Amino acid sequence: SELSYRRILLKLSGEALMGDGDYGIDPKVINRLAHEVIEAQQAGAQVALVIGGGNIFRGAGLAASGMDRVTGDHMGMLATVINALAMQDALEKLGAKVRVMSAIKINDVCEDFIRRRAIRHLEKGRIAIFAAGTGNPFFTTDSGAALRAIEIGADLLLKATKVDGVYDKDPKKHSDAVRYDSLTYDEVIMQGLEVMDTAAFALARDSDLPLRIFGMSEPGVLLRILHGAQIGTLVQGRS
Amino acid sequence: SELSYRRILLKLSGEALMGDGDYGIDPKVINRLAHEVIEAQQAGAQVALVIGGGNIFRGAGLAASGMDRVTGDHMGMLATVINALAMQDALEKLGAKVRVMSAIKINDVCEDFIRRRAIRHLEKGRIAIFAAGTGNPFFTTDSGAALRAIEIGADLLLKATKVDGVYDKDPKKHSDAVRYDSLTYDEVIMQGLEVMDTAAFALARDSDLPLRIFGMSEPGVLLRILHGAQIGTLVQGR
Amino acid sequence: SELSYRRILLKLSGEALMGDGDYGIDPKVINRLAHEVIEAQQAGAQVALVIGGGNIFRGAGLAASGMDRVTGDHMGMLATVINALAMQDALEKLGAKVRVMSAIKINDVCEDFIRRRAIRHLEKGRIAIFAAGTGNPFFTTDSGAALRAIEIGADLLLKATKVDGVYDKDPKKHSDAVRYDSLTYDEVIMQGLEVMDTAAFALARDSDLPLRIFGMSEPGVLLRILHGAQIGTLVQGRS
Amino acid sequence: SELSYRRILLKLSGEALMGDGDYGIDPKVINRLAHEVIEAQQAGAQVALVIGGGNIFRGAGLAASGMDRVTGDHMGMLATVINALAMQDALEKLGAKVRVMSAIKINDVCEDFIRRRAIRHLEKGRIAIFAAGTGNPFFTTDSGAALRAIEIGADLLLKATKVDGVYDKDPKKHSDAVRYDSLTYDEVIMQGLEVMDTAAFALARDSDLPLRIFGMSEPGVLLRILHGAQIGTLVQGRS
Amino acid sequence: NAMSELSYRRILLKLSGEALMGDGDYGIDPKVINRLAHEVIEAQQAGAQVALVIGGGNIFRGAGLAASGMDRVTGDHMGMLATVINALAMQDALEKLGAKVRVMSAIKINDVCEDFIRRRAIRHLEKGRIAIFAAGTGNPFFTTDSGAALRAIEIGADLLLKATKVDGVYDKDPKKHSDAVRYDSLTYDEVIMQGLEVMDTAAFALARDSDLPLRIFGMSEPGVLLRILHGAQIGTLVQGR
Amino acid sequence: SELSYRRILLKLSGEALMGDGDYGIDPKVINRLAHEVIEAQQAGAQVALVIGGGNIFRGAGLAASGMDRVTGDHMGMLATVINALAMQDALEKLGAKVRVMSAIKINDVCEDFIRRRAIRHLEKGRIAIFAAGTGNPFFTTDSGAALRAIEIGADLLLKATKVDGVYDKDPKKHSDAVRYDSLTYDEVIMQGLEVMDTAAFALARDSDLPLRIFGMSEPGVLLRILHGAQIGTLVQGRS
Ligand SMILES: Nc1nc2c(ncn2[C@@H]2O[C@H](COP(=O)(O)OP(=O)(O)OP(=O)(O)O)[C@@H](O)[C@H]2O)c(=O)[nH]1
Ligand SMILES: Nc1nc2c(ncn2[C@@H]2O[C@H](COP(=O)(O)OP(=O)(O)OP(=O)(O)O)[C@@H](O)[C@H]2O)c(=O)[nH]1
Ligand SMILES: Nc1nc2c(ncn2[C@@H]2O[C@H](COP(=O)(O)OP(=O)(O)OP(=O)(O)O)[C@@H](O)[C@H]2O)c(=O)[nH]1
Ligand SMILES: Nc1nc2c(ncn2[C@@H]2O[C@H](COP(=O)(O)OP(=O)(O)OP(=O)(O)O)[C@@H](O)[C@H]2O)c(=O)[nH]1
Ligand SMILES: Nc1nc2c(ncn2[C@@H]2O[C@H](COP(=O)(O)OP(=O)(O)OP(=O)(O)O)[C@@H](O)[C@H]2O)c(=O)[nH]1
Ligand SMILES: Nc1nc2c(ncn2[C@@H]2O[C@H](COP(=O)(O)OP(=O)(O)OP(=O)(O)O)[C@@H](O)[C@H]2O)c(=O)[nH]1
């Protein structure tokens, strides 16, 4: 119809999946998220999802020290597959065709990431769900999210965080805090504002990937954003 | 030298790994479980390990009731790799050599189960840690476990569960069942006792695989069983 | 459709491919079976085949009494890949679209087995042919057939054998052997009647897989069955 | 030290395994052959084997007259994996160390072929058994043996046949059939003699591979040839 | 462009890697790469199903890479990888002109392109895609020509076109005989008999085994490929016995 | 014995292999390099090397500015396998044991990168050659070298460049220039000195990987460095 962003990639921490739970997934949250996503898709947007695995890579048993750093990242990556698999069902049950694609080979469980396939999947009206990040350890979920966004040539990367947008002085350690309507990559760096870890930000800044930091709490957000509403902060261009 | 069982495979429900917490794993039961395992290799035994994923694959959101079974089984498989890796890491810190092997290919994370390879690894005195069951959906963790046991030509499949063995009707409820110090295969079927699901039990039976249902509550239980200790039940023969 | 069952899985022993020879494939038998299959498909049936390998993996040299059981199972598995390849070329000679899918990776030769892919193929009018059982040793052709049936959500698993159905008394012992029309998994277990090995039978038992044991003596029979013919013995139900 | 040839590749047809039978493998024949291979390997030879598949890929059912040639060849390649597996067993029963290596990937069943791995296996004293030819249709087993020979740096390529060497006229037509002791590659082609198919013969020639065509007529033949004995025909050099 | 004008339906066109070089001494001349792409697209528009095979000699060259005493196999792998690079270049030039391309490799490099599967390759031809085949047969010791003939037979091609410097097969060396003539056609046998070079022995036999029609010609001027496809007697045709 | 660094990763440009050429590999530059590496080896160091592909993926034809960036990065990754394959040949000629590992699967040609395998190889005294960077487009060779260095627990990442260290200005037109002997990561950032691209540096910063930026002008610099010598610039520390 009238979209301001044709192809998008929505990334979330996955702790966000837990909800008020302390672990795993909360059927309530995943149900709303799947619904948000399905509205986006129906509206005409080719949608891609990235979801971290922090809801599963939890506890002293797992996330506590000693654990070989590489081994923990591998585990984390498996966790994001499990999550991707749950979004796949929740969504298909609701009529969408889903294509989970993993940055590491686990062919039994889901297909391999291949840029040319992914694009064709988005073009056919399917939801792309990416898992396992970039495929290497030492890279955050934002990095893989950025990379994937750039590969598929997305119009916008949506990073859903607890705080809705970027603020000057914490929406807590201040009452007067104002939400930047928009920012350039440089304005961010110059003002020491932090959005994604250095590497992930550089990656996004080299391709000038439109970023949007925002909440996700209120239903209909994707629909507003797709239709133009200035929601959260928008990171774009290079001053 | 001088053991009742030379190549062994130890099977845990994984939900075991949780112990205190309701999810994931607690380092306590892991470290100790690793020790029990180290100790067997010390004795001079060839050890295999298979652990479930129900500790990571749990909760309403993940193990949803109206959930596709395959999707769900894949998730469980994945869960078992996670636990497999945790054990690898814990076991390696204590200096032991290990080899995690997956029934479904995930080479980034660990090698593929290759029968000739898993065996070879045991001969070099490494601990084989198998994950992802048989790599098929609809098969229990028991099935995968029996399969691998037969595969490596294991002398003994050890299943650690809640109850300390195989009881007629269970402990407490009905003049405290007498723990059969043994029980042929056909006997288990005739009497309709539970050990493993039909399919798993059938596999184990067909190759005449010595079972052994027991509890790992006291530390040192494994070292004893190997020597000759008659703990828990022991399923065998016809 | 114009037939009761639409998505079915037909399983033969493959020894049932040698006809009157003592090892190969019999052009008679395979052309005859091709027509049956082509016919059903032409009537809207989504057909999957599983054919064993006892016609290739035979002889003292190959099925040596001793011999590593695992390496024997691997020969049987490859045997089924060869049969499937033959069933492919025969079906394609008659204008059918075929997808052979093996449970062990041999991608040069035929496509890997992937549940989602297989269904797709089926709902596209193609004949799916599965080879190499469950991909595991110590598992019979039937287990592999039950597994695939459940996986693809077939309405019926047809197992073609010598004895047409199941009888109370042994049909070669008594002339007064009675053939049941139907039976429940319990009724079979309890009467200690044998239709598949324990494992295979159990697998299908956990999914109430509608089994049909029958003899593929004369042509037409496959089509009659899809219409509702009380041929052989139906096994279905937890009763 | 006493050897005229340290690394050799011995190629046999698949029919060489059947014995008097009309299919599969004769336990007694594969045993002799195994014994002869051990005798060589113990005298300090490094041995690669290549066995064809015509003992399994035979009969009007499998080797159908007008079947798809690619499908035909793939069936054959699978036939060879089955033979190599049987050879492996036989050899291993008698304490030999063995590595089956396939030209197409079937990792479940046997390891992949990789030139560096293979040469290494040979250095360690293992018997190398190569299956599936070149991994391509339209190429013969002879071509696959020639290829493997060059890749592993064989000192000699042996091709075991029914007729002990190359005779001017078939040793059944004119009773005065004379055997050649040595022939250049060019002499063979010149005399229109039929040793290997054109492509395989050219690979042998261009790679400078001495080639001995002989029959395994009696025990100890392989070992003798290994010590320089002139049995059968030697194809070497150019004109 | 009337499909009724097609003398050949499915073709495989084969070039040496050096062709992409043009005047430079290395790699790819974008001038050359574009004209090739234009010729190919032109053939596709006439209704042809087009398969492509380009060697790696433009990249695997120089004392350093192709050193006289290096390991023959690693050398061949190098060429194979060169071939994958060329194919990607072609993929990008063709796609930029609106063509739909599928690179397929004889050795698995799945990040980079799909691997060769016969039945897949054929379906791509059916759907109107240009197939670009890389890495020969996937084995060392086989020439590009060998991979080319294999692929041609495997996809059921009506013709294998090998582009070379010389514009056909002459009865005699034209650089040595002024009376030398270009054959319009030759049987596979007449080539052997007259000791004429067309492909190395192994690749010729494989082509000969399946009676693959071959057309040896020179891509000297634009439009030559479309003319061949419309029946032009250009270069030399090898076919039959 | 001595040795101030046990496990190193030496990273080269690629064009560094060209020498007096405009493309490819100068066999002179490659041999004295092998020599340097082999010397570092024969002194007890465990050596991993990473070489770019700029010598091969260049010229408007290959490195076309208007070309799809992903497929260009892929061409680059392939060029680095070629380079790796040539180093391997030269080093083995001089008697070294070499393991070439690529970040994207190409098993025919070399092995996959697997962190535990690479460590093992390094413990058995083999030279590890890493090709294809991280396996993702949009990532530099630096990024790849930093990753591998961390993954393998390198004690030092050497980066050979055009000039002999980090300077406060261009030393080729300025005899004025001041070379820094050592810098902290945070110093490099605030002084705006270019060492690596931002992502690579952050990747290197997070694990506090010791960097040694130096020029391989004269034979023996590698060895000297291994022995404590203070050549080029050292980057390290978090002040
Ligand atoms: N687990 C797993 N699933 C796969 C793989 N490849 C494809 N699939 C799934 O199989 C289903 C259908 O397979 P595809 O082969 O992608 O079929 P397609 O022709 O693109 O799609 P349709 O047009 O919908 O038939 C999809 O839902 C994919 O998610 C794989 O390698 N592994
Ligand atoms: N993630 C992963 N690790 C692997 C894989 N294959 C081997 N490894 C690990 O790499 C390490 C050593 O590799 P190996 O291939 O065993 O090397 P090796 O030649 O046995 O010689 P040893 O290390 O002495 O056995 C071990 O920790 C293995 O578990 C794989 O496919 N994936
Ligand atoms: N041998 C082999 N064939 C394959 C493999 N994957 C796909 N195919 C074959 O490729 C051909 C078609 O390619 P697909 O990948 O199915 O293409 P698709 O768009 O679903 O389907 P079509 O509509 O049939 O073109 C069929 O003949 C398949 O059997 C494989 O791994 N091995
Ligand atoms: N089926 C199959 N077997 C394999 C594969 N890789 C190795 N093997 C077998 O595994 C056994 C030994 O494992 P390897 O990894 O070769 O061990 P290795 O350390 O070189 O050599 P050894 O330990 O002396 O065997 C041998 O019998 C191999 O044939 C494979 O990919 N598939
Ligand atoms: N690099 C790489 N690309 C692949 C691979 N497999 C498929 N592709 C590409 O993915 C894209 C689409 O996949 P296909 O699955 O072939 O789609 P299809 O539906 O026939 O055709 P379209 O929808 O018309 O593109 C194509 O550009 C293929 O080149 C692979 O293994 N590696
Ligand atoms: N091309 C390619 N080569 C491989 C691959 N895996 C191993 N190799 C090579 O094969 C050779 C020997 O196999 P390895 O399995 O490394 O043997 P090893 O037991 O580690 O011990 P060595 O024989 O001492 O090297 C080595 O040169 C490895 O480079 C692979 O996947 N592809």
PDB file of C-alpha atoms in Angstrom, chain C residues 91-207:
ATOM      1  CA  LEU C  91       8.478 -43.699 -12.901  1.00  0.00           C
ATOM      2  CA  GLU C  92       9.967 -40.852 -14.856  1.00  0.00           C
ATOM      3  CA  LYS C  93       9.749 -42.915 -18.036  1.00  0.00           C
ATOM      4  CA  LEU C  94       6.005 -42.699 -17.485  1.00  0.00           C
ATOM      5  CA  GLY C  95       5.904 -38.925 -17.060  1.00  0.00           C
ATOM      6  CA  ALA C  96       6.013 -38.831 -13.271  1.00  0.00           C
ATOM      7  CA  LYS C  97       7.967 -36.334 -11.268  1.00  0.00           C
ATOM      8  CA  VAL C  98      10.105 -38.039  -8.684  1.00  0.00           C
ATOM      9  CA  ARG C  99      12.238 -36.946  -5.743  1.00  0.00           C
ATOM     10  CA  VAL C 100      14.408 -39.611  -4.203  1.00  0.00           C
ATOM     11  CA  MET C 101      15.395 -38.631  -0.703  1.00  0.00           C
ATOM     12  CA  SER C 102      17.905 -40.527   1.358  1.00  0.00           C
ATOM     13  CA  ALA C 103      18.229 -40.630   5.139  1.00  0.00           C
ATOM     14  CA  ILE C 104      22.025 -40.513   4.828  1.00  0.00           C
ATOM     15  CA  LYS C 105      23.830 -37.818   2.865  1.00  0.00           C
ATOM     16  CA  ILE C 106      24.709 -38.818  -0.683  1.00  0.00           C
ATOM     17  CA  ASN C 107      23.925 -35.545  -2.429  1.00  0.00           C
ATOM     18  CA  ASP C 108      25.794 -36.260  -5.632  1.00  0.00           C
ATOM     19  CA  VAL C 109      23.276 -39.054  -6.108  1.00  0.00           C
ATOM     20  CA  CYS C 110      19.920 -37.982  -4.686  1.00  0.00           C
ATOM     21  CA  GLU C 111      18.568 -35.271  -2.460  1.00  0.00           C
ATOM     22  CA  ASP C 112      19.003 -35.279   1.278  1.00  0.00           C
ATOM     23  CA  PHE C 113      15.940 -36.083   3.363  1.00  0.00           C
ATOM     24  CA  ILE C 114      14.341 -33.028   4.948  1.00  0.00           C
ATOM     25  CA  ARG C 115      10.887 -33.221   6.374  1.00  0.00           C
ATOM     26  CA  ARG C 116       9.772 -29.802   5.213  1.00  0.00           C
ATOM     27  CA  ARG C 117      11.147 -30.312   1.696  1.00  0.00           C
ATOM     28  CA  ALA C 118       9.448 -33.724   1.427  1.00  0.00           C
ATOM     29  CA  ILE C 119       5.965 -32.416   2.247  1.00  0.00           C
ATOM     30  CA  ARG C 120       6.386 -29.598  -0.253  1.00  0.00           C
ATOM     31  CA  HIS C 121       7.320 -32.132  -2.872  1.00  0.00           C
ATOM     32  CA  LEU C 122       4.223 -34.177  -2.039  1.00  0.00           C
ATOM     33  CA  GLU C 123       1.804 -31.239  -2.198  1.00  0.00           C
ATOM     34  CA  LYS C 124       3.268 -30.558  -5.639  1.00  0.00           C
ATOM     35  CA  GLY C 125       2.185 -33.843  -7.190  1.00  0.00           C
ATOM     36  CA  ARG C 126       5.596 -35.498  -6.987  1.00  0.00           C
ATOM     37  CA  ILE C 127       6.316 -39.124  -5.909  1.00  0.00           C
ATOM     38  CA  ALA C 128       8.650 -39.216  -2.907  1.00  0.00           C
ATOM     39  CA  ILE C 129      10.968 -42.176  -2.547  1.00  0.00           C
ATOM     40  CA  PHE C 130      12.830 -42.614   0.705  1.00  0.00           C
ATOM     41  CA  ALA C 131      15.953 -44.670   1.049  1.00  0.00           C
ATOM     42  CA  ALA C 132      18.322 -45.728   3.813  1.00  0.00           C
ATOM     43  CA  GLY C 133      15.646 -46.230   6.441  1.00  0.00           C
ATOM     44  CA  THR C 134      15.984 -44.004   9.507  1.00  0.00           C
ATOM     45  CA  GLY C 135      19.637 -43.453   8.661  1.00  0.00           C
ATOM     46  CA  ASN C 136      20.526 -45.580  11.720  1.00  0.00           C
ATOM     47  CA  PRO C 137      21.786 -49.144  11.965  1.00  0.00           C
ATOM     48  CA  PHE C 138      19.841 -51.741  13.954  1.00  0.00           C
ATOM     49  CA  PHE C 139      16.612 -50.342  12.567  1.00  0.00           C
ATOM     50  CA  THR C 140      14.448 -52.167  10.060  1.00  0.00           C
ATOM     51  CA  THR C 141      12.872 -50.911   6.854  1.00  0.00           C
ATOM     52  CA  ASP C 142       9.553 -50.712   8.641  1.00  0.00           C
ATOM     53  CA  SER C 143      10.869 -48.345  11.294  1.00  0.00           C
ATOM     54  CA  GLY C 144      12.104 -46.148   8.503  1.00  0.00           C
ATOM     55  CA  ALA C 145       8.734 -46.447   6.854  1.00  0.00           C
ATOM     56  CA  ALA C 146       6.762 -45.629  10.016  1.00  0.00           C
ATOM     57  CA  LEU C 147       9.051 -42.665  10.703  1.00  0.00           C
ATOM     58  CA  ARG C 148       8.593 -41.233   7.242  1.00  0.00           C
ATOM     59  CA  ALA C 149       4.851 -41.782   7.380  1.00  0.00           C
ATOM     60  CA  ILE C 150       4.466 -39.888  10.559  1.00  0.00           C
ATOM     61  CA  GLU C 151       6.813 -37.150   9.448  1.00  0.00           C
ATOM     62  CA  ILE C 152       4.911 -36.513   6.187  1.00  0.00           C
ATOM     63  CA  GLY C 153       1.494 -36.865   7.865  1.00  0.00           C
ATOM     64  CA  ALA C 154       0.332 -39.649   5.576  1.00  0.00           C
ATOM     65  CA  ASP C 155      -3.302 -40.749   6.027  1.00  0.00           C
ATOM     66  CA  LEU C 156      -2.291 -44.365   5.616  1.00  0.00           C
ATOM     67  CA  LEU C 157       0.795 -46.575   5.785  1.00  0.00           C
ATOM     68  CA  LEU C 158       0.508 -49.505   3.385  1.00  0.00           C
ATOM     69  CA  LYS C 159       2.797 -52.429   4.036  1.00  0.00           C
ATOM     70  CA  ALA C 160       2.752 -54.990   1.172  1.00  0.00           C
ATOM     71  CA  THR C 161       3.712 -58.499   2.257  1.00  0.00           C
ATOM     72  CA  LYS C 162       3.144 -62.120   1.249  1.00  0.00           C
ATOM     73  CA  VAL C 163       0.206 -63.024   3.558  1.00  0.00           C
ATOM     74  CA  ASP C 164      -2.763 -60.827   2.570  1.00  0.00           C
ATOM     75  CA  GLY C 165      -3.682 -59.211   5.911  1.00  0.00           C
ATOM     76  CA  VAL C 166      -3.642 -60.741   9.385  1.00  0.00           C
ATOM     77  CA  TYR C 167      -5.353 -63.958  10.447  1.00  0.00           C
ATOM     78  CA  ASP C 168      -6.089 -65.390  13.918  1.00  0.00           C
ATOM     79  CA  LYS C 169      -4.674 -68.822  13.040  1.00  0.00           C
ATOM     80  CA  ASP C 170      -1.724 -69.322  10.703  1.00  0.00           C
ATOM     81  CA  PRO C 171      -3.109 -69.329   7.148  1.00  0.00           C
ATOM     82  CA  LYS C 172      -0.590 -72.008   6.079  1.00  0.00           C
ATOM     83  CA  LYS C 173      -1.384 -74.196   9.086  1.00  0.00           C
ATOM     84  CA  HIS C 174      -5.185 -74.078   8.977  1.00  0.00           C
ATOM     85  CA  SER C 175      -7.595 -73.919   6.082  1.00  0.00           C
ATOM     86  CA  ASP C 176      -9.992 -72.372   8.597  1.00  0.00           C
ATOM     87  CA  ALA C 177      -7.779 -69.298   9.005  1.00  0.00           C
ATOM     88  CA  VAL C 178     -10.018 -66.208   9.200  1.00  0.00           C
ATOM     89  CA  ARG C 179      -8.817 -62.858   7.821  1.00  0.00           C
ATOM     90  CA  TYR C 180      -9.659 -59.824   9.979  1.00  0.00           C
ATOM     91  CA  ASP C 181     -10.951 -56.673   8.278  1.00  0.00           C
ATOM     92  CA  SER C 182      -9.500 -54.437  11.010  1.00  0.00           C
ATOM     93  CA  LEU C 183      -7.780 -54.569  14.398  1.00  0.00           C
ATOM     94  CA  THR C 184      -6.447 -52.149  17.008  1.00  0.00           C
ATOM     95  CA  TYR C 185      -2.825 -51.832  18.127  1.00  0.00           C
ATOM     96  CA  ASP C 186      -3.850 -53.388  21.427  1.00  0.00           C
ATOM     97  CA  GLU C 187      -5.775 -56.261  19.831  1.00  0.00           C
ATOM     98  CA  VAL C 188      -2.624 -57.035  17.833  1.00  0.00           C
ATOM     99  CA  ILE C 189      -0.205 -56.802  20.774  1.00  0.00           C
ATOM    100  CA  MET C 190      -2.519 -58.805  23.040  1.00  0.00           C
ATOM    101  CA  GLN C 191      -3.150 -61.538  20.476  1.00  0.00           C
ATOM    102  CA  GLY C 192       0.635 -61.597  20.016  1.00  0.00           C
ATOM    103  CA  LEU C 193       0.267 -61.261  16.261  1.00  0.00           C
ATOM    104  CA  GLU C 194       3.201 -59.917  14.271  1.00  0.00           C
ATOM    105  CA  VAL C 195       2.928 -57.101  11.706  1.00  0.00           C
ATOM    106  CA  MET C 196       6.166 -55.198  12.248  1.00  0.00           C
ATOM    107  CA  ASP C 197       9.067 -55.645  14.680  1.00  0.00           C
ATOM    108  CA  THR C 198       8.470 -54.321  18.210  1.00  0.00           C
ATOM    109  CA  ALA C 199      10.241 -50.955  17.683  1.00  0.00           C
ATOM    110  CA  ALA C 200       8.608 -50.123  14.321  1.00  0.00           C
ATOM    111  CA  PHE C 201       5.255 -51.227  15.601  1.00  0.00           C
ATOM    112  CA  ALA C 202       5.672 -49.082  18.694  1.00  0.00           C
ATOM    113  CA  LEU C 203       6.628 -45.946  16.752  1.00  0.00           C
ATOM    114  CA  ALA C 204       3.453 -46.130  14.701  1.00  0.00           C
ATOM    115  CA  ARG C 205       1.658 -46.965  17.932  1.00  0.00           C
ATOM    116  CA  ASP C 206       2.536 -43.597  19.485  1.00  0.00           C
ATOM    117  CA  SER C 207       1.052 -41.781  16.484  1.00  0.00           C
TER     118      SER C 207
END
